[PDB]
Design an enzyme around this catalytic site. Structure first.
Site, PDB file in Angstrom:
ATOM      1  N   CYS A  97       0.833  -1.200   0.000  1.00  0.00           N
ATOM      2  CA  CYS A  97       0.000   0.000   0.000  1.00  0.00           C
ATOM      3  C   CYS A  97       0.872   1.256   0.000  1.00  0.00           C
ATOM      4  O   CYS A  97       2.099   1.187   0.120  1.00  0.00           O
ATOM      5  CB  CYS A  97      -0.828   0.033   1.279  1.00  0.00           C
ATOM      6  SG  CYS A  97       0.229   0.357   2.741  1.00  0.00           S
ATOM      7  N   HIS A 108       5.420   6.415  -3.247  1.00  0.00           N
ATOM      8  CA  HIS A 108       6.639   7.093  -3.657  1.00  0.00           C
ATOM      9  C   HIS A 108       6.327   8.522  -4.073  1.00  0.00           C
ATOM     10  O   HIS A 108       7.018   9.466  -3.671  1.00  0.00           O
ATOM     11  CB  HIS A 108       7.313   6.394  -4.838  1.00  0.00           C
ATOM     12  CG  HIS A 108       7.555   4.934  -4.624  1.00  0.00           C
ATOM     13  ND1 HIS A 108       7.469   4.010  -5.645  1.00  0.00           N
ATOM     14  CD2 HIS A 108       7.848   4.234  -3.502  1.00  0.00           C
ATOM     15  CE1 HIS A 108       7.725   2.802  -5.164  1.00  0.00           C
ATOM     16  NE2 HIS A 108       7.962   2.910  -3.868  1.00  0.00           N
TER      17      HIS A 108
END
Ligand code: ICS
Ligand code: CLF
Ligand code: CLF
Ligand SMILES: [Fe+3]
Ligand SMILES: [Fe+3]
Lengths: 522, 477, 522, 477
Positions: free
Chosen positions: D59, D192
């Site tokens: 996740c 990210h």
């Protein structure tokens, strides 16, 4: 001095400044001790290749041997028979030692008598000792059988055990029918395992030699199992367990597992369980006889084949994966019992463990010692694990055994940097772990002194001991463990991999220095 | 339990023996009378063990090598004969020492000639000589060698005396031959004697005419303390705080130079009378050094001993004696206050070797405990003479007790605690009776001195009052 | 650089001079790091009582917790049922974590699905996820049952599991008769053990609530056993073994021992063994239901009593001598089976080991943590061994439980210096092991970092970790061990006494300094 | 395995699914054609996972906290929410660092707000503010704090941005709010992105006015190397031997100050494109810093990389480049000589995250091995573009593979070795297929650089050729 609420035993009491000063004064005052720089100098020298070469040229001097003497094994064999008193004909010093040696390893009572031969018997023999000894033993300790071995005094003076026992019966010291099997067990021949073999063949003889007329191989539908000199309770247990699981009829000949593990329930039981006289009387009626430790059951093998007419299968000790497989397959063949689902699953669980742990085990280098069958099984399993058994020492090994081990090594890439040593002791082994340092030792408690010596050279030269063998005196309850079968293999794998991970955790525990590799997950 | 009941306990137990053994063992069991000053009149000892009865005794090699000579740290001791003796006795006795093992000290190592059949048939003297040369090569810092004979050596007619003389001269080395073969005597005891004689003949005389040692009026030797768990260190510290100079320790942590210097001392302080009275009597006769017996078990005996010893010297020593006694008073008092209430009235049976079966009684009594039975493996009547006054009236005494005897005594008497050896320990634990090892100190100690008393007390308490003992009966019986 | 015949991994590669100089340059040039003297100063302060006081005033901040979240427990519970797939309704990140967490502890596959709810489902709910998820799971992994729990996303938005599951059946995504037990398992409530209790009650409900009319207590002659959250394979095994030895009919409800120990034999088995649906259906006909870990099975308890009408016995976790005895006696009473001679002797053997080892165990001081039932059992056995459990930590413990533990402490002199802490974490524990130093810690792998911290203060301040609990990630195959019963007590005792003796050997290994006490025999 | 067979494998495996699932998964499975340079035209990626199919994906919190932020060593990272996420992700990723943990560095510690019901009902913003004060008291040497949001934070309307600004201004401390809730996006990937954005917005600008940094022509930053098993150190060493100055490492063994100095460098060297192309593009746009992709897996890629990087500078750097390459030539050649013959021809299937599924192919090929299958959990189409040229023709590609798919693929393809993660490892070991962990490096590594190749080679050999693999079938079957 002591603080009453934090009392110090020898360690660390004698590190107090006043003891330290006192000890320094004794040294300087009266010990005429070599200077420390000279001590360091000689120590470093004992770590060298040069010192190793002199060490290996010894012919007459043994130092820190890795074997004991015959009657020790005879005793352990005798302990495995129902209500049987081991009885060592000869000098009593020996028996105090046998008992204590086993007491310390098993943390159990170890019952054994002597007939206390002294300097008088040295010139007229020990016949009277045997007469009164047998009578006294039988009456006082109420055994159903007395199993007689000898100390080296009795061997040298040449006492004829058979005649002395026959005369004891003839002159009414014990009943004629009372079983008194015997064996000559000279301590100056072979080792403790030879004593075991001798004692066992003697008992088998006693109960079968003159009764072979009515015997028929296979008529009792059972397989005999002879364990040999065995000091892990789990090993007797695992064998019976697997054979039971297979639905295989068996007779374990010499089975001390009960008498070496009595409950603390308020009473002392001098005897418990063990192989019955009947089982020995009837053993020739078995389908066959399997020797768990063939490399010290040679005399026994000759008798079983020569007299019982059994065709003893060529089987290695069942240690590791391949040899447990072969053992079970042979038992299956002999008995007509398929290997059950339960053992097949246990096998796969061991294999699963090998796959899980193989990356830490890979290439790990070991120095190891012990009795020949144990050592060869350990070597075999190590190769199965992708480990390198670099220094393999069997003080009581022989030429034929060494050839065998050497062939097992040659059959694997992991055996490439390994050498097998026979007739060598732990002072030889000490040199090897300095000059060709392994990652660990697998051995008995005497190995701790080698670890000590290696750490004194330096932390980066320390070789930790992993205790597997006999005797183990400095840890509690390892004698309950198992080294045979899949169960034993699992136990060994687990102890090996975790000793490896323990040492890695130690080497990576230094804050901001080596702890970059102090991983939570391994 | 009364004297009537103990005499009848004895008779009943003896009923299982065959005729000859019954008659023998009867002489080795007695009920104490502290009236009797001649133990000879109530018990006999130092006789052969009856065959087949499971004596707890060892042999003369145990007495010489394991006990007297083994502890000497800077010599190499050869177990000469087959591989057993040297291996069973390897590091089993906790005769502590300071050293660099394998380099300048060798106590925990097992050096052996590992006799084979060819050595039995043709003799081992040539092997022994070769072994000596190999020792010198690989262990250059050894300061002497002893040769501890196992059973075969004398039987086969070897001559270790000659090998020792010849090699000793060739290498200018002290090599001590000891004919301590286990067939000799009846127990460890003759081993002590033999080993005492060996020291006298081959070591003790070495500096007889040598005057370089600077002696003081306060020089003593500790004779017969094998430093078990550090016992001799925790004894030494006290003697030296008293102003004495301890020149020698025989033989716990002892050095060969200390032994050689002992004839320079002013007083031999004998702890273990049994093992070293021989050499002490010798030193008195030959060098005029007097010797005295002492006891460092518990505060009462230790205090009494420091005082007796100080009295042999001058007022400066007697003064420091009282200073030591005052220093340790609060420490041993706190120990008593803590542990006596936990042990008061508890009853103990002891079976040990040749000293401790009487010598520890005082320490047990300093914790309010009662020794209701004691005995020795290999004691002589002079030991029993010393015992009967230390034991209470109508207590049970046993000499060379059999395994059968000891078990049956314990079943009837039901002591709260038993103190004995490793061959006994696991038996009594199963019977639910707390057990303390009184040879090895159960891997604890020291027990000697004021500092040892603390450990002793902690130990008796931890075991006697351990939760494990209430658990032996399953609640479903 | 590397030498090809001696390849170095991170340790010790990065100790090479060139790496060391590079790391120094990195630090000096760009990291702007506090001077070492300042780091040393703050470190020392973190070891103080003053720091401990601040640390114990924390209200909002948790640091290194000793618990995990509900659905983890729900998953482990579900795994204990035959061909059952654990299914966590909510976000998928959670399931990757549950699976890995258990993978690392068991070194086994851990199968579990999610229905991958995203941002969109966060504002119209996950009904469509349930429909497609249930259908996809059933078809793809062919389970016989799907057991549904929730992640905190699903809980916060309020998805109604019963409705969503009913709508999935109503609209034909899965058959009406396909079992889909469910339980809400909010992670901001209780911990992982609460998840276990919730899932279990959910499953028991599913198979029994509606068919209670035809049930008769005692009619099947068995006893139900509920293990709770249990991560040692030996614990399911020993329970089943003892009851089989007693000849006691039983049903172990949630039994993952097989699917967490499949053989490596060439095939992956997604499912294996487990409690059957028929077993859960028939459970109300048992004589009674025994809860092995009562302190996290409160909800289960109410359902079993309230609906099944079983009068759940008041039994502690069967750990140690007294509580194993009690377990066995109550089972004997409920079932009519006497305790066989086999278990009596095993009990006696544990007692023997206690007598053998008591002198090294006596007075040893421990810090320890874990789940409530495991912790109180460890505490109870430590007292039985004469050890002092001085710092007792249960992050997920409650007030009632703490009182219970305090009463256990008060009943023994060995509990006199002990304190129980609840709601505290391993950063709190770290202070206690500095300020009131014990001899060892007994705990899970997170404890290694507390050992590291202690060593950094100094070797004399190091507190070694003894790994007992969950998770254990940095050693291999300890999940095979046993902590329950006489067998478990034997293992625990053995690990404790040997950890003590290992540490003593370390401290006495210094040649000429501390080795006077490096005894061969202990 | 021909192209036609691989296509049939795909259709057959898809036969198990319900209509909707099969239609989706068909779009995420493809047979490589290295001619095709628009991956879009052969495979879809970066879409939601289908429910219930056992994706391997994590996740957004994993991508932000676990991957990007967690490794930064001198900050404290708060897992803000219930206890699960922070605990499962505690010390699971081997982002190595130098520091004094709990004092000046905090990587392997789990700090959490351990949300309880009262925080869910009433919000956690006050708890956060209190938590920050407690952190600052007990961990004074931290140089900043990040707040990593777990699922509930956004869902309940908390405002961590405001708490951070207020508390950051109050304490003069960098406090970074990260809205990385795991319900966001479809995978670690959006994590990210969110994480890069938070760096830009809350840290990276801090020294925009600062001219005290002593810059050089050779300053670089290593962007997207998380130092797994030391990977970034064994990369860094080569760059600096080449004469470059590595100002920053993002984020393995990374410090907050290094992050703040990165805008001063001459060149951003991007290893993990997927996780840090976002901040690299921003830095080019805002500071004019060029960025380039590189690859330090195996000798071929590392040599090519050193050379391309050097070419961005001057002749002195290109000269040092060649000196480095010459230095290590014999070392990696010796590795190839020893290990390639043991591995030649062996077939590997990979499944990993966003980079390694393509980046490690060259290292396998340097050992004569063939990657017959690869895939990613969470890559985007620009990753698959980079992949189709690295993969051989007619190889299998799988995006967000399902557990069922991966198992069925392996059964048919029968690779000699599989390289994937912890959730996969024990499955394939049971099937008797050698497995190496290609996230954690199976507790080994580094694998980056020349020193890394030697370990990678050792590792693939020890496992592929281990004796255990021939023992899976019992001899009586
Ligand atoms: S020497 Fe003797 S048996 Fe006096 S042989 Fe024996 S270390 Fe005993 S009662 Mo072991 S006469 Fe010493 C003895 Fe006492 S070995 Fe120790 S404990 S005080
Ligand atoms: S009474 Fe004493 S201990 Fe006995 S032998 Fe004699 S000196 Fe020795 Fe060593 S080798 Fe074995 S144990 Fe004996 S039988 Fe030959
Ligand atoms: S998708 Fe990712 S890991 Fe999942 S919650 Fe969301 S951010 Fe976190 Fe931590 S606590 Fe447990 S595991 Fe979840 S259910 Fe609540
Ligand atoms: Fe015991
Ligand atoms: Fe596994």
């Amino acid at each position: 001095s002591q603080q009453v609420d934090k009392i110090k035993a020898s360690y660390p009491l004698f590190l107090d400044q006043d003891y330290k000063d006192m000890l320094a004064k004794k040294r300087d005052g009266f010990e005429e001790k070599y200077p420390q720089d000279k001590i360091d100098e000689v120590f470093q020298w004992t770590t060298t290749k040069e010192y190793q070469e002199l060490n290996f040229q010894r012919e007459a001097l043994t130092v820190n041997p890795a074997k004991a003497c015959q009657p020790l094994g005879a005793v352990l064999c005798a302990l495995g028979f129902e209500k049987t008193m081991p009885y060592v004909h000869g000098s009593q010093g020996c028996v105090a030692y046998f008992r204590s040696y086993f007491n310390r390893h098993f943390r159990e009572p170890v019952s054994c008598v002597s007939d206390s031969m002294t300097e008088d018997a040295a010139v007229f023999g020990g016949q009277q000792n045997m007469k009164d000894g047998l009578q006294n033993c039988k009456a006082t300790y109420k055994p159903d059988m007395i199993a007689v071995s000898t100390t080296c005094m009795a061997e040298v003076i040449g006492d004829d055990l058979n005649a002395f026992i026959n005369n004891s019966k003839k002159e009414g010291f014990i009943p004629d029918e009372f079983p008194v099997p015997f064996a000559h067990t000279p301590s100056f021949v072979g080792s403790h395992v030879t004593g075991w073999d001798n004692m066992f063949e003697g008992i088998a003889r006693y109960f079968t030699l003159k009764s072979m007329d009515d015997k028929v191989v296979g008529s009792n539908k059972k397989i005999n199992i002879v364990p040999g000199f065995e000091t892990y309770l789990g090993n007797f247990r695992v064998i019976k367990r697997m054979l039971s699981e297979m639905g295989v009829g068996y007779s374990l000949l010499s089975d001390p597992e009960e008498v070496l593990d009595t409950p603390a329930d308020g009473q002392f039981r001098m005897y418990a369980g063990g192989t019955t006289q009947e089982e020995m009387k009837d053993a020739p009626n078995a389908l066959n006889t399997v020797l768990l430790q063939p490399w010290h059951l040679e005399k026994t093998k000759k008798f079983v084949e020569g007299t019982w007419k059994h065709e003893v299968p060529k089987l290695n000790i069942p240690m590791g994966l391949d040899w447990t497989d072969e053992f079970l397959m042979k038992v299956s063949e002999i008995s007509g019992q398929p290997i059950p689902a339960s053992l097949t699953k246990e096998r796969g669980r061991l294999v699963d463990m090998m796959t899980d742990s193989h990356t830490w085990l890979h290439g790990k280098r070991f120095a190891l010692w012990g009795d020949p069958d144990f050592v060869m099984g350990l070597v075999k399993f190590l190769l199965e694990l992708g480990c390198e058994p670099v220094h393999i020492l069997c003080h009581n090994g022989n030429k034929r055994w060494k050839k065998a081990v050497d062939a097992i090594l040659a059959a694997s890439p992991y055996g490439k940097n390994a050498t097998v040593y026979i007739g060598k002791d732990l002072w030889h082994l000490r040199s090897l772990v300095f000059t060709d340092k392994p990652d660990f030792m697998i051995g008995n408690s005497y190995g701790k002194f080698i670890q000590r010596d290696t750490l004194h050279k330096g932390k980066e030269f320390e070789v930790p001991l992993i205790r597997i063998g006999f005797p183990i005196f400095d840890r509690h309850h390892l004698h309950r463990s198992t080294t045979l079968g899949y169960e034993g293999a699992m136990q060994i794998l687990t102890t090996l991999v975790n000793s490896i991970l323990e040492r890695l955790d130690e080497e990576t525990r230094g804050m901001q220095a080596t702890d970059y590799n102090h991983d939570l997950v391994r | 339990m009364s004297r009537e009941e103990v005499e009848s306990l004895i008779q009943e137990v003896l009923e299982v023996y065959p005729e000859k053994a019954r008659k023998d063992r009867n002489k080795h069991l007695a009920v104490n009378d502290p009236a009797v000053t001649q133990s000879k009149k109530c018990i006999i000892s130092n006789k052969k063990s009856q065959p087949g009865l499971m004596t707890i005794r060892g042999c003369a090699y145990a007495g010489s090598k394991g006990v007297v000579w083994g502890p000497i740290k800077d010599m190499i001791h050869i177990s000469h004969g087959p591989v057993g003796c040297g291996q069973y006795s390897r590091a089993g006795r906790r005769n502590y020492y300071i050293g660099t093992t394998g380099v300048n000290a060798f106590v925990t190592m097992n050096f052996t000639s590992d006799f084979q059949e060819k050595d039995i048939v043709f003799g081992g003297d040539k092997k022994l000589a070769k072994l000596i040369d190999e020792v010198e090569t690989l262990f250059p810092l050894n300061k002497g060698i002893s040769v501890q004979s196992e059973c075969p050596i004398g039987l086969i007619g070897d001559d270790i005396e000659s090998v020792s003389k010849v090699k000793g001269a060739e290498l200018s080395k002290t090599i001590v031959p000891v004919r301590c073969e286990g067939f000799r005597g009846v127990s460890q005891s003759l081993g002590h004697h033999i080993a005492n004689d060996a020291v006298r003949d081959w070591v003790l005389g070495k500096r007889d005419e040598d005057t370089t040692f600077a002696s003081t009026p306060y020089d003593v030797a500790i004779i017969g303390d094998y430093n078990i768990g550090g016992d001799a260190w925790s004894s030494r510290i006290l003697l030296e705080e008293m102003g004495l100079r301890c020149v020698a320790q025989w033989s716990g942590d002892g050095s060969i130079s200390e032994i050689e210097l002992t004839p320079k001392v002013k007083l031999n302080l004998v702890h273990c009378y049994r093992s070293m009275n021989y050499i002490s009597r010798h030193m008195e006769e030959k060098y005029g050094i007097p010797w005295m017996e002492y006891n460092f078990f518990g505060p009462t005996k230790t205090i009494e001993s420091l005082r007796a010893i100080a009295a042999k010297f001058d007022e400066s020593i007697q003064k420091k004696c009282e200073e030591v006694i005052a220093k340790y008073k609060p420490e041993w008092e706190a120990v008593v206050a803590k542990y006596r209430p936990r042990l008061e009235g508890k009853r103990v049976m002891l079976y040990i070797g040749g000293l401790r079966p009487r010598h520890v009684i005082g320490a047990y009594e300093d914790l309010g405990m009662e020794v209701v039975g004691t005995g020795y493996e290999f004691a002589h009547n002079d030991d029993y003479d010393r015992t009967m006054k230390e034991m209470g009236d109508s207590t049970l005494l046993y000499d060379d007790v059999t395994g059968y005897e000891f078990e049956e005594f314990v079943k009837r008497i039901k002591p709260d605690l038993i103190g004995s050896g490793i061959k006994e320990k696991f038996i009594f634990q199963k019977m639910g009776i707390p057990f303390r090892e009184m040879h090895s100190w159960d891997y604890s100690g020291p027990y000697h001195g004021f500092d040892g008393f603390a450990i002793f007390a902690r130990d008796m308490d931890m075991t006697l009052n351990n939760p494990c003992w209430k658990k032996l009966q399953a609640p479903w019986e």
